């Protein structure tokens, strides 16, 4: 599916990922797409911060939704 992962910098990218993919693998996909360190990436959906070891299903995230990607102070 496609989820709209919107970085805090305003870079809204449409990410193609499986509903059963881990947030870890999602970060890998974004690390391929834009090239961002997974640890630095904090995905927040509806106010829920997503853990690496959990999937899109663990937080009940439907496709074609907008997730906010807030980066750590790792890149600053």
């Amino acid at each position: 599916m496609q989820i709209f992962v919107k970085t805090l910098t305003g870079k809204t990218i449409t990410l193609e990922v499986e509903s059963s993919d881990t947030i870890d693998n999602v970060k890998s996909k974004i690390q391929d797409k834009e090239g961002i360190p997974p640890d630095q990436q904090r995905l927040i959906f509806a106010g829920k911060q997503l853990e690496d070891g959990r999937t899109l299903s663990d937080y009940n995230i439907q496709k074609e939704s907008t997730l906010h990607l807030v980066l750590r102070l790792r890149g600053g």
């Binding site: 805090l8 927040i44 106010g47 829920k48 906010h68 807030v70 980066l71 750590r72 102070l73």
Partner: protein, 71 residues
């Protein structure tokens, strides 16, 4: 208190903070912008009622008067 100029913002996104350094911001409440230039991604906000201060995502806080009412 020297930081008496509390710039007012409104929290749009309901964000539950797990760490104490992070601020649990309930959607629809009021927050004070402590620092907004120290960092770009995470800002310092303080809950108006709860009095709790902490780090929150920049685009989760929308300053009042600024762009919330031009009508």
């Amino acid at each position: 208190m020297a930081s008496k100029s509390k710039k007012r913002g409104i929290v749009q996104y309901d964000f539950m903070a797990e760490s104490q350094d992070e601020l649990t911001i309930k959607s629809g409440d009021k927050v004070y912008i402590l620092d907004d230039k120290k960092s770009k991604d995470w800002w310092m906000c303080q809950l108006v009622d709860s009095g709790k201060s902490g780090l929150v995502p920049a685009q989760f806080i929308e300053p009042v008067r600024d762009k919330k009412h031009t009508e």
